[PDB]
Design an enzyme around this catalytic site. Structure first.
Site, PDB file in Angstrom:
ATOM      1  N   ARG A  49       0.815  -1.203   0.000  1.00 32.16           N
ATOM      2  CA  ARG A  49       0.000   0.000   0.000  1.00 32.16           C
ATOM      3  C   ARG A  49       0.870   1.284   0.000  1.00 32.16           C
ATOM      4  O   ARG A  49       0.614   2.279  -0.698  1.00 32.16           O
ATOM      5  CB  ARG A  49      -0.957   0.022   1.232  1.00 32.16           C
ATOM      6  CG  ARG A  49      -2.006   1.072   0.867  1.00 32.16           C
ATOM      7  CD  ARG A  49      -3.237   1.369   1.675  1.00 32.16           C
ATOM      8  NE  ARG A  49      -2.937   1.958   2.943  1.00 32.16           N
ATOM      9  CZ  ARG A  49      -3.633   3.010   3.422  1.00 32.16           C
ATOM     10  NH1 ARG A  49      -4.623   3.594   2.741  1.00 32.16           N
ATOM     11  NH2 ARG A  49      -3.317   3.471   4.638  1.00 32.16           N
ATOM     12  N   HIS A  66       0.791   4.113  -3.006  1.00 32.90           N
ATOM     13  CA  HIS A  66       0.485   5.505  -2.677  1.00 32.90           C
ATOM     14  C   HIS A  66       1.527   6.608  -2.981  1.00 32.90           C
ATOM     15  O   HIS A  66       1.172   7.788  -3.172  1.00 32.90           O
ATOM     16  CB  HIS A  66       0.146   5.595  -1.193  1.00 32.90           C
ATOM     17  CG  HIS A  66      -1.313   5.325  -0.819  1.00 32.90           C
ATOM     18  ND1 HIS A  66      -2.103   6.064  -0.045  1.00 32.90           N
ATOM     19  CD2 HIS A  66      -2.054   4.248  -1.241  1.00 32.90           C
ATOM     20  CE1 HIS A  66      -3.273   5.487   0.008  1.00 32.90           C
ATOM     21  NE2 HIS A  66      -3.240   4.395  -0.714  1.00 32.90           N
ATOM     22  N   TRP A 103     -10.504  -8.417   2.603  1.00 31.68           N
ATOM     23  CA  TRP A 103     -11.079  -8.819   1.316  1.00 31.68           C
ATOM     24  C   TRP A 103     -11.244 -10.320   1.135  1.00 31.68           C
ATOM     25  O   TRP A 103     -11.944 -10.837   0.248  1.00 31.68           O
ATOM     26  CB  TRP A 103     -10.220  -8.317   0.140  1.00 31.68           C
ATOM     27  CG  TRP A 103     -10.332  -6.799  -0.016  1.00 31.68           C
ATOM     28  CD1 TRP A 103     -11.233  -6.212  -0.887  1.00 31.68           C
ATOM     29  CD2 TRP A 103      -9.632  -5.871   0.724  1.00 31.68           C
ATOM     30  NE1 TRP A 103     -11.109  -4.911  -0.667  1.00 31.68           N
ATOM     31  CE2 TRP A 103     -10.169  -4.659   0.270  1.00 31.68           C
ATOM     32  CE3 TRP A 103      -8.629  -5.924   1.658  1.00 31.68           C
ATOM     33  CZ2 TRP A 103      -9.709  -3.443   0.742  1.00 31.68           C
ATOM     34  CZ3 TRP A 103      -8.174  -4.718   2.116  1.00 31.68           C
ATOM     35  CH2 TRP A 103      -8.694  -3.502   1.676  1.00 31.68           C
TER      36      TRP A 103
END
Ligand code: HEM
Length: 291
Positions: A45, A49, A188
């Site tokens: 992540r 980003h 998820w």
């Protein structure tokens, strides 16, 4: 703007493999983080980003300048929670002080994927740190509450086409959402720190239900206890995206091949590489070295 890649003076493939080996041994060691998910997910992540701020129209943003180190970007609301990935990497930067920030933040991403059993990602060195006045303003990372039209349009600013967007989006099988960071809550899937095509199978095989959560944001919840964000659900609402979702739910190797190709592209956007430059590096895993 032109940003030419400059190799850290004196370093070769073996210097970089040592930074990889250091990140990877610390991943194995700090395995209790987030209820034993570990740091692999927060590090891919953080690499998406710092790269996802790129603007193809004027060449501002992107991984090159390592500007996440600066206050404005560090305190961007869309980056909430990435401070844990930063603090993990900070000791490794004190140990190898010659590597640039954009090279360390992006190599954390590549190391996490290969060490969570994912595809091998070719990586290139050469990002150069840039000044505080080059830090992109907040508001260039994507919202969660939107549809497939918003996604196609958002990712065209990083010039990713449909296949690259669905492949890249599969890296949401990893980790979980945190109510305090984003206003969303839940994982998820089951295998949240091994890299697999599970995001595609869950989206096609579960009985998703739209519900609001405690932060008043909507999300799709399944019986199993998994969740999807509105933008994730969109990939089965759009017919071009849905066919590519089917392909990867049926072929994890086409998923790995295309993720690989797209994730390197996302990490190299905005960077001109001279052809005296070193070829992309394919780093060995701890397991491949016997460490
Ligand atoms: C329109 C696209 C996307 C949106 C709206 C989005 C949004 C989010 C949100 C809301 C979170 C949870 C934050 C938290 O509460 O801690 C999250 C987590 C995550 N994102 Fe995305 N995401 C998108 C695309 C991507 C892409 C392209 C990647 C990777 C290549 C990615 C990888 C991750 C990972 C690994 C996590 C887990 C973080 C953790 O466990 O702490 N995301 N995303």
């Amino acid at each position: 703007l032109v940003h030419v890649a400059s190799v850290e003076k004196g370093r070769s493939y073996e210097d970089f493999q040592k930074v990889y080996n250091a990140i990877a041994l610390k991943l194995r060691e700090d395995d209790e983080y987030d209820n034993y998910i570990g740091y692999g997910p927060v590090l891919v992540r953080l690499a998406w980003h710092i790269s996802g701020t790129w603007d193809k129209h004027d060449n501002t943003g992107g991984s090159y300048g390592g500007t996440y180190r600066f206050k404005k970007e560090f305190n961007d609301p869309s980056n909430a929670g990435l401070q844990n990935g930063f603090k993990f990497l900070e000791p490794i930067h004190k140990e190898f002080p010659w590597i640039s920030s954009g090279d360390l933040f992006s190599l954390g991403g590549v190391t996490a994927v290969q060490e969570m059993q994912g595809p091998k990602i070719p990586w290139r060195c050469g990002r150069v740190d840039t000044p505080e006045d080059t830090t992109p303003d907040n508001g260039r990372l994507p919202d969660a509450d939107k549809d497939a039209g918003y996604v196609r349009t958002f990712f065209q600013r990083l010039n990713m086409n449909d296949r690259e967007v669905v492949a890249l989006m599969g890296a949401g099988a990893l980790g979980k959402t945190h109510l305090k960071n984003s206003g969303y809550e839940g994982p998820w899937g089951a295998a949240n720190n091994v890299f697999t095509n599970e995001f595609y199978l869950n989206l096609l095989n579960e009985d998703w239900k739209l519900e609001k959560n405690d932060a008043n944001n909507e999300q799709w919840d399944s019986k199993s206890g998994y969740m999807m964000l509105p933008t994730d659900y969109s990939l089965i609402q759009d017919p071009k995206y849905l066919s590519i979702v089917k392909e990867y739910a049926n072929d994890q190797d086409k998923f790995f091949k295309d993720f690989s190709k797209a994730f390197e592209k996302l990490l190299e956007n905005g960077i001109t590489f001279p052809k005296d430059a070193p070829s992309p590096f394919i780093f060995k895993t701890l397991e491949e070295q016997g460490l």
